[PDB]
Amino acid sequence: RPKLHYPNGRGRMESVRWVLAAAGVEFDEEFLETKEQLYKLQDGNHLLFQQVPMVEIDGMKLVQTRSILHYIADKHNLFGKNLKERTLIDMYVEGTLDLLELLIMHPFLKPDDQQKEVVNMAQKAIIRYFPVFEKILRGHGQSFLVGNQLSLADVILLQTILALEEKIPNILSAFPFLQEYTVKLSNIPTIKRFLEPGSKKKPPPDEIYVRTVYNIF
Amino acid sequence: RPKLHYPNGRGRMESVRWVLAAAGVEFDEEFLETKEQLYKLQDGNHLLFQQVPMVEIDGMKLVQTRSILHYIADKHNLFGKNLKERTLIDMYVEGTLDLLELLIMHPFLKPDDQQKEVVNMAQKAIIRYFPVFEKILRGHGQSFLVGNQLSLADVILLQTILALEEKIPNILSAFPFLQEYTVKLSNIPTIKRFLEPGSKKKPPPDEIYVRTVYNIF
Numbered sequence: 001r002p003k004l005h006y007p008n009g010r011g012r013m014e015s016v017r018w019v020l021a022a023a024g025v026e027f028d029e030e031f032l033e034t035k036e037q038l039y040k041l042q043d044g045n046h047l048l049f050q051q052v053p054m055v056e057i058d059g060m061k062l063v064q065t066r067s068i069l070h071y072i073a074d075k076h077n078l079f080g081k082n083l084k085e086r087t088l089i090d091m092y093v094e095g096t097l098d099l100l101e102l103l104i105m106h107p108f109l110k111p112d113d114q115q116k117e118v119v120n121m122a123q124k125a126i127i128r129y130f131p132v133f134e135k136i137l138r139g140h141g142q143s144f145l146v147g148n149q150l151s152l153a154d155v156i157l158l159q160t161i162l163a164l165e166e167k168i169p170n171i172l173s174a175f176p177f178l179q180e181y182t183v184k185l186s187n188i189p190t191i192k193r194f195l196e197p198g199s200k201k202k203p204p205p206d207e208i209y210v211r212t213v214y215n216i217f
Numbered sequence: 218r219p220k221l222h223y224p225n226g227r228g229r230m231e232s233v234r235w236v237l238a239a240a241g242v243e244f245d246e247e248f249l250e251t252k253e254q255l256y257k258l259q260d261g262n263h264l265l266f267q268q269v270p271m272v273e274i275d276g277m278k279l280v281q282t283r284s285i286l287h288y289i290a291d292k293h294n295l296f297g298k299n300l301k302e303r304t305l306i307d308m309y310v311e312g313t314l315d316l317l318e319l320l321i322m323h324p325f326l327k328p329d330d331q332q333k334e335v336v337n338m339a340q341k342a343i344i345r346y347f348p349v350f351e352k353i354l355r356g357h358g359q360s361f362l363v364g365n366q367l368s369l370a371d372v373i374l375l376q377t378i379l380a381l382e383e384k385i386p387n388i389l390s391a392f393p394f395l396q397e398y399t400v401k402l403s404n405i406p407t408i409k410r411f412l413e414p415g416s417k418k419k420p421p422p423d424e425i426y427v428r429t430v431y432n433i434f
């Protein structure tokens with residue numbers, strides 16, 4: 001059963017929770033609360049590069065969010081069925097992570113800038129990302145971005161869209177395909193559960209998480 | 218023959234040049250010089266996400282540096298021989314790209330901060346990265362990080378180390394394994410050529426490149 005090392009909050013680890021959950025995998029979490037716990041982790045050489053996320057799985061201690069995500073995907077049929085697919089999924093995912101980053105950085109912005117930022121996510125989403133996906137979907141009519149099966153691309157996208165909606169609730173207004181897609185995906189049982197109460201899905205970060213992260217790093 | 222879209226300079230594209238070169242692949246380049254050329258590129262829908270790098274290869278227009286690198290690696294035996302390997306290479310690479318980023322951002326810093334920054338790269342390299350690799354190498358005695366064959370991890374690492382050395386010439390002083398490794402790698406013929414004159418290898422960015430990039434973005 002995988003073990004997740006990270007502070008108790010979303011940050012960069014959330015994607016990993018999403019994927020694991022979606023793949024139907026149960027896992028554990030070991031929260032960081034202080035510099036010191038981080039040191040111990042570091043000290044025992046558990047963090048290849050001294051950072052988290054780190055996830056212990058299949059006897060390894062993987063680090064680097066993307067690397068971790070690829071591993072899981074590949075262990076769980078979330079990476080396509082061939083190079084072509086794999087290639088698409090990869091790109092989609094990277095592009096998406098670039099959008100998600102805005103959300104990740106958000107809480108650490110200066111309150112003043114926080115607002116300008118939301119506007120920016122809105123614009124990027126609307127203009128740079130949503131349209132690509134909307135068209136993809138519109139173009140093949142399937143419920144998945146790639147290969148008519150769930151992929152890592154769909155989870156990250158789903159994760160991101162929902163996160164955005166938390167700040168800009170109507171962000172999908174003009175993306176009817178994306179709206180439907182979201183809906184369905186969210187009805188996938190593992191996902192449906194993850195979205196339900198008592199999942200390891202984390203809440204949007206608060207003043208505390210923020211404080212804490214600062215305290216550990 | 219691949220076609221590289223990017224300004225005429227290193228930026229994020231350099232890794233791609235390195236890999237292609239190393240893999241012995243010849244390619245072309247289409248330089249961006251103005252906002253306008255970027256617009257046209259964008260306008261014709263050639264940039265999946267409206268950004269570069271974009272590389273046209275095997276009939277696709279790939280975007281996202283990492284995604285691009287994985288594609289090439291996978292088309293050229295630079296991604297290991299199995300999941301285990303692939304997994305290592307992946308991590309190494311991501312960690313390395315995190316270091317390289319410092320170099321990428323450098324020129325756009327405020328001159329004052331530029332210096333503090335160099336010191337920082339030095340420290341990170343010394344403390345967080347070099348040691349991992351040095352030990353890996355020291356631990357198996359091979360000339361490659363993984364699988365006793367060239368991998369994407371070795372190229373990125375090589376690229377990075379050399380770039381650092383351009384600013385901190387003795388950065389490898391305490392990494393005798395890394396020094397040797399570097400030397401040998403640099404003697405790989407494709408690499409040896411890339412390093413020689415008349416390669417598509419780019420120079421460290423100047424006031425111009427800097428200016429230009431700003432002008433296009």
Ligand SMILES: N[C@@H](CCC(=O)N[C@@H](CSCc1ccccc1I)C(=O)NCC(=O)O)C(=O)O
Nearest residue numbers: 011012050051052053063064065066104105217
């Ligand atoms: N590229 C890596 C980077 C991971 C990383 O940056 N980890 C940091 C925390 S990022 C905190 C952060 C930073 C910027 C924005 C959001 C967030 I959350 C860490 O473990 N640092 C330990 C150390 O350096 O001692 C990844 O995606 O896994």
Ligand SMILES: N[C@@H](CCC(=O)N[C@@H](CSCc1ccccc1I)C(=O)NCC(=O)O)C(=O)O
Nearest residue numbers: 228229267268269270280281282283321322434
């Ligand atoms: N994660 C992507 C991002 C690529 C990217 O940021 N591309 C930018 C230039 S980065 C410029 C930059 C920015 C920060 C530091 C170094 C560098 I070079 C682009 O095409 N922008 C076009 C647009 O947005 O209109 C990658 O690695 O491919």
